[PDB]
Amino acid sequence: GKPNILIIMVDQLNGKLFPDGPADFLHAPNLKALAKRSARFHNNYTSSPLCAPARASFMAGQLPSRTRVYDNAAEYQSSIPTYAHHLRRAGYYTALSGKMHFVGPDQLHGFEERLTTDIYPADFGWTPDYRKPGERIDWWYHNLGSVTGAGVAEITNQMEYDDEVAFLANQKLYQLSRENDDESRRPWCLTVSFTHPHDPYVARRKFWDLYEDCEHLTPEVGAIPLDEQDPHSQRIMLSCDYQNFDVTEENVRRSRRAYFANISYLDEKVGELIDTLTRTRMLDDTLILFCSDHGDMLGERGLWFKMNFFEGSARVPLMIAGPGIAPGLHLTPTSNLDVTPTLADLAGISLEEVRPWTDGVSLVPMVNGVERTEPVLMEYAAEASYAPLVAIREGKWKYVYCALDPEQLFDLEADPLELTNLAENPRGPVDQATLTAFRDMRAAHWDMEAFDAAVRESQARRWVVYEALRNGAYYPWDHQPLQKASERYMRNHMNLDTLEESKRYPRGE
Amino acid sequence: PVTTGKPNILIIMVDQLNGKLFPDGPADFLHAPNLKALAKRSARFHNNYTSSPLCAPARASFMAGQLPSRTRVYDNAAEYQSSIPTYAHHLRRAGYYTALSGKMHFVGPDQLHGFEERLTTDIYPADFGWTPDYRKPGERIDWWYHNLGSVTGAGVAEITNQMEYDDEVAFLANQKLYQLSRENDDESRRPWCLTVSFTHPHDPYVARRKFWDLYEDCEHLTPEVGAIPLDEQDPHSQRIMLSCDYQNFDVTEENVRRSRRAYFANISYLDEKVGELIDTLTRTRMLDDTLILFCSDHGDMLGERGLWFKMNFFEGSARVPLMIAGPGIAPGLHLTPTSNLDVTPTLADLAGISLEEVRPWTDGVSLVPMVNGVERTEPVLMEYAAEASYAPLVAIREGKWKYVYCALDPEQLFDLEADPLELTNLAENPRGPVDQATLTAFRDMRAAHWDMEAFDAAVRESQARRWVVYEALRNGAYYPWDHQPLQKASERYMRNHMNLDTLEESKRYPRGE
Amino acid sequence: GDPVTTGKPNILIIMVDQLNGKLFPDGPADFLHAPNLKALAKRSARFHNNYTSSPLCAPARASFMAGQLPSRTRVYDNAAEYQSSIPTYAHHLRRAGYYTALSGKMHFVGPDQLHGFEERLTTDIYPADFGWTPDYRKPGERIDWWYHNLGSVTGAGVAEITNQMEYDDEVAFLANQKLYQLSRENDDESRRPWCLTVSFTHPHDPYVARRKFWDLYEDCEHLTPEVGAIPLDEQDPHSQRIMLSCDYQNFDVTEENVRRSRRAYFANISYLDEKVGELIDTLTRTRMLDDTLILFCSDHGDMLGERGLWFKMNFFEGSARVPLMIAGPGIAPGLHLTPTSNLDVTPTLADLAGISLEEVRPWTDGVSLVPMVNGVERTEPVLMEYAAEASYAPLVAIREGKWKYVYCALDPEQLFDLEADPLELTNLAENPRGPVDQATLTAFRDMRAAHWDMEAFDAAVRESQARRWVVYEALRNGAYYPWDHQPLQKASERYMRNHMNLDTLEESKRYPRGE
Amino acid sequence: GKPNILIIMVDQLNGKLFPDGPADFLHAPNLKALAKRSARFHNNYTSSPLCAPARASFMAGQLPSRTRVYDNAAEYQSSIPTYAHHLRRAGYYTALSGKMHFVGPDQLHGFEERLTTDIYPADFGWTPDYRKPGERIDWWYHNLGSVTGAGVAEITNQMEYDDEVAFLANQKLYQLSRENDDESRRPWCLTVSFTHPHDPYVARRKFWDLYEDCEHLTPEVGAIPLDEQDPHSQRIMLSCDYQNFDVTEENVRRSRRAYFANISYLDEKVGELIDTLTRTRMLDDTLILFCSDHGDMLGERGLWFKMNFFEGSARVPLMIAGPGIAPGLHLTPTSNLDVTPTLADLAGISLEEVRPWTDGVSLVPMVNGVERTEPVLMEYAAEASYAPLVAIREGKWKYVYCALDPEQLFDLEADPLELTNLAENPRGPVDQATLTAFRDMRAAHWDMEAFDAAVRESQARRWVVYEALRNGAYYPWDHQPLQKASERYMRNHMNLDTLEESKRYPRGE
Ligand SMILES: [Ca+2]
Ligand SMILES: [Ca+2]
């Protein structure tokens, strides 16, 4: 009686565009219809605003300071258990189709089968250096060329990837449908991880035309000048090479437009999976989760992409639908760290077998009306950072600390667009009492000096190794998926009539 | 040597498509909008025939433009040697990039046969398992022979072995066009030739609910010619009926209607896959420079005369569609009989290859003159030496006549103009002195083209040779010959020996928009 | 179900390339340092007058494997495709329940690199595509980048590693490792009998050997050929075609070049002989020697400077004769003089392996040598063919009794009495001794015309060449798909992995057991 | 001008059998000839008396507490630099032929090329459990059936391995000899790591017959009954299932005889490698290193195999020969940790580039007569242990500590056969000053409870992941060496006569 699980994951989806399901101006009929079925979490946050740290954190349900995956090139240990391990241990068939940005020779991390390679490298190339602050590496750093180069194309590096990811995921759903009717079956858990709407902001003409009438192509907060920016936002501008880009107003609208178009481009792929689940008669016993690793500022405050804790960068959608899930909207802040314990909870796995391996909490009690009190923690220690940054999100507050930065405190009920720093300009004795309470919480959770030393050791270690691994013949760690052709379709060690019935589903119709 | 200006070629192929369903493009009752739109653009050949009504022999013949008696690929498990040049060889030698996505039923260790790249594996085996034996006439091998279980088991399903195959044949083909589109703004570009070979509408007659619903108000669910009893059937048809084990099957009338309905539905399932390729070609801005061919390897009787599947020379099993559209092709309908043997020399001709370099390697003729209104007089030849046959059968199609010979059977001759549904054997019941003179003329033609005794000897030797070899190869550890496609992941997408900004621009098309 | 294999012997076929059969009169010659091959000869039935089917790597080997003439295998040259459907002795043995394995060279051209073999331990040293295709349409031309040239003679010498030596060392090691692996199956009575083929490239040129073996022939006297260099004007038309195909015009072959070439050639024979002892010792120590038939053979010979010619591609004795020895259980030792052929190996192996001759007769052009081993007289003649480089039309040859008759439509016929003319210096076709020579010549013309239609032969070779040049030109455009064999011993299934038992693993991999 | 380096390594070579080169009674003529050329280290020790922890420590020059490779199933992370990395970074071609017991998906660890797979598994199967002390695991633990099963065989799993290891190593040397006339040649470093003389004690008859007149088939210490043994040796006896084995004296003699025979089996393979180097004319420019991971008690004290710090299990040979090495004997205790910094030193690498990555010291100064003062550290935290054990080896003393065991102090000058525990029975006023000094040294180098916590976390982490990875289809991590045949020997994209000259060496002769 254990259910199936379908995890639909996109990269770089600004959670603010999902207030109660997709925003009304978004042309996303399938994600909207899924929202009406699902328990939606309005204030869900990432664990680290970046591909590799968030995804390694997402898989294991552990903070980057515990997974040791500090940036886009830190090695992910094979020994770290993920939700793939937990479900597989409980009898689940686990599969990943798409991107998880595993760095290191391990590219499965518990997944029994991976349907595609990764769009992004798996080596120690994108290693930052805290030793040299202010330096940027042009051949892999983010720059504002994604904004000035936004436009329309029929194929891209990301669309070739997502077309492959979407097809192979639907092929696996069709394959697993053949194992229905058999009740010695293993429940399957397939993860469909798309790269859109990550930059470049380029979409196909069919979806680009859907947003001709759009008015949300202008950010809520305009471009804050550099000298009025907080130190961390300045560093992000430094790492984006702002000085060599004149981003016009049209560059901002076109980039937001193709971003919105690529969301619709994804909503068509979500509808394919739902349609496949419906025609294969697996939809009723399948949990469906929507999630994302981090967000995109999308020009707000003059910032693009991620690498900060602002709402656009730190917030990601989170929706859970399926049998036993009561639909509704939830406002208590959640974290991506809670996905792995929630997945095991829905899979009947006992809480004592997940407690010592995740730092998050199961959301199933929250779905059924039980109040959650645990705060939401966020860390970052990659590019545009010269020392680790930590962040706490509790109730209506967001606290951000960095040993080189003045602290930030935001009342998100009274200041949704975080423009007033309550740590610098407190409103009253309650703001100062809240700031002191978050300082005690932060010191109880983080040793910021050991955090910095651990990140520096990780960087200096991987560099010496990477300079060596890049001499002589290179040995790639990119995952090479193999469907054995000598065991597919018709081979002369079977029987044609027996094979045709076994590959056909539904049968007898 | 010229290089630029040569067109792209997209060969859309389907398996077991009755050519009678394509009289002037798709028949009106068929819900095939994309194929109807491609037809009116193309030079359609009304009377196109296969080379051999069987999957593997027709495909080795289609590739090389040679008769099965020349390719030695007599049945569904005869070795296709590497040295035999195919149109993939001719185009590739002329500077084309050649790619195959789908089924070609190659038997042997060579699964490319000139193709520079092959995107999928084959749906059917590549060993000597399906080898018939002329030494044992009357035998039947249940584990791979055709049987009427496809007719009694026809129906609806959302996934099948064939639908899984065609779904990834189609996707990988469109992904390759997207990939090839990135090379479009390059003047030094190699012209590409991509073959998309689908397995549908080959049986089982099982289609998705969406397409099965399209044919609820259909009237062609009953064959034009009902089931001829075994006592009144020609010797070859009875052999096909016994090789299908029709005795252990009670085909209801509803069995026929369901089989045909799913067959037409899977034609619509294919037509939607045709529109994807056309739409990919159009949006990638490659449509105007791309010749498009639609063809098939053999037909399907679909219950006509009580027969199903193929392995005979009747119109339903021997006739296949053939349409060519694109630059330099005047649309129109042609009635002179054509053959699948003509595709290879036609492809080489359309691609600027001099036919002096192709004629010593093909038995057919280029259809390019016929497109431009030139009269073609070469006859259409057909062979068969596989299951349900105890000796080779040969056929000649010329003008309005079709003559079928076998050393063990009475001769057959039909006047397809006066007798489209072949019910009057003019060899057994001539209408006058002309039919008697026509029968004599084809006997002299057949004797001039075939040594039917040496034909039977070469087939018997090829079967016995394979039975000793396949005996050993199935002992001990098996070494498979199935094609394993490999797109090296260490060289796709973003890898840290490239530049991220340069990669994104190269993998993006169209550029600058 | 499983074929009956009780009481059937193992078969170890030791093969070499370019071994002049005249160096094996009654086993290895006396002057050769070959203790292990000499010990094997005194155990074995020795066929003094064994001949190749075609003097060249690929045509002889496709013929050797199937027991069919090149005209039947269609493998005319070093680039002709070997069809997968042609049954070989690997097929025949494997059909009867044998485990078949090949370690070394067989020069298969085409996508099939096994041809019945269940396991191949190495890749091939030579290409598997249609590159080395001759063209009868351009007679007199030569292709420098793969044709034989006399640089092998002028560059003969000493080296510790070569392309061939890296290969044969890998061939010899994996052969002994496979014998070691099979020895663990040795106390199982439900085991399959094995047939392992070990094919070495030596003593194929380059004539380069290691110092250890080169020093063995410091005192040698056979460094000068029995027949000196014949001038080009006094050579037969075919020998002239071989000389120009070897680019003799731009090579000043000194006598010292001849001695160094023969010395390194003889040294590489001792190099091979030490590898023979390694195999014999592995059989002895694994306790599989007494149930294992051992066959020594070669694909063709080498002229070694005799008549001024080098390498092969001709029907003279030094190029056409190869050794053939059969040792093991049931084989009575002795020397045999009736001419035999490499075509006979395949039916012989099937006869020794208890396979009924009615299942191999329709697939071989040779006869079993087992009766000859047991004193039964053999009357079938030895047929040879050649249709490759240095030839502009196919050549054929008949070897019967004391005569050798060579015919080519472009050449004067050749007839030699090998009893009276062992070094074939008198062409009895041109200068008959009496009325018997004229009658014998006519008898061979009738034998030839009954076996070969030299017109259809020349047409088939020309079709095979032109068909490949079209395909090969295309296959060498764009991304190349290689056909070379890639051996794979899955590392995930070797040694100690964590799905087995450690103590059960050691006992199963240990042999002998209980000692 | 940088020299070649040949590292010949063996598993479980009792260091006491190599006092000043091979012992006289051992028939090792090739290793004795190499000893006369090399700097010989009489008192060299392992970092950890176990296969995988020692080699992980041997590769990186770091203690098992730093590499986190505590047992035969602990993950060796890819970011840890090894001497392969250091040499590869310095322009060396690095190759490994043989066994290194890498656990995890990385089977290269800086090695540009690996010629064979490993003889032992690479997953987390052999994982101990501190939570269940006193309970062994039958299907991979050591048992004394190796002693009762010693004998003669012509093929074993280890000999098939070492025969392949030795051949592919000599083939690589021949292959590298072709590059030997280029001035732009990369210096090569080939590591030939054999598995012998690891148990099973089974040898070929040719070598077994060499030791018929031997008088060393009896251990110097007889079997110490269980009640008189130290607690650690008692757990070793229980972890070996000693109660289910009646070990005859002939069982002891046959085990040592096959062990000594396999040393001669290795000495012949050593002579092969030297002969290959000599004939290819690379001998004069090649440094040769003989070493081992740990030793074997060989019945001494009634113990077999390793897992302890006694001389027979903790001592290993270490010899360095080649250009720029002065032959001679050395008695100051050295460690396997010193090999990686010694290799970098001999390869011209600056000491400041390996200083932060190694816990050892370069032995090159000691070779030239400079006194070495650094003590030798050893750790163990695997089977037959319920808590980590540490050990210090300085001057003439060896101190062993464990939180669950009485301390041990041995004066190896007066007590080479460690029979008198000076910690329990002191002799004079120095023996208790010395024990107090080693307690200060041990407390300064080791947090024994943090050590026990890290080992326990590693064990519980892997038991969860391995249980999952062993469900469904298994993904093997074993190394698959592949020399692509499409690029070897004669292929038709080359020139035949150009190829024969390039593959022939020496040329022109
Ligand atoms: Ca991301
Ligand atoms: Ca040869």
Residue numbers in the entry:
A (entry chain F): 4 to 512
B (entry chain C): 0 to 391, 392A, 393 to 512
C (entry chain A): -2 to 512
D (entry chain G): 4 to 10, 11A, 12 to 391, 392A, 393 to 512
Paper text:
SmCS-catalyzed turnover of choline-O-sulfate in the presence of H218O showed no incorporation of the 18O label in the choline product, indicating that SmCS hydrolyzes choline-O-sulfate via S–O cleavage, thus employing a class I mechanism.
In order to understand the determinants of substrate specificity and catalytic mechanism, we crystallized SmCS and determined its three-dimensional structure by molecular replacement and refined the structure to 2.79-Å resolution. The enzyme crystallizes with eight molecules in the asymmetric unit, and analysis of the structure using the PISA server suggests that the protein is tetrameric with each of the protomers containing two oligomerization interfaces of ~ 2800 and ~ 1600 Å2. The protomer structure of SmCS shows a globular protein with an α/β fold, a central β-sheet surrounded by α-helices, characteristic to proteins in the AP superfamily, confirming that SmCS is indeed a member of this superfamily. The most noticeable structural differences between subgroups within the AP-type ASs and PMHs are in their C-termini, which differ in both length and sequence. Well-defined and continuous electron density was observed for the active site residues (Asp14, Cys54 and His297) that tetrahedrally coordinated a metal ion. This metal was thus refined as Ca2 +, because it predominated in microPIXE experiments, presumably reflecting its high concentration in the 2 × YT medium, and this was the metal ion used for modeling the crystal structure. Additional positive density was observed in the vicinity of Cys54, suggesting that the latter was partially converted into fGly during production in E. coli. The active site is closed in this SmCS structure, and the loops that cover the entrance would need to move to allow the subtrate to enter and the products to leave. A hydrogen bond between Asp500 and Asn146 seems to act as a latch that stabilizes the closed conformation.
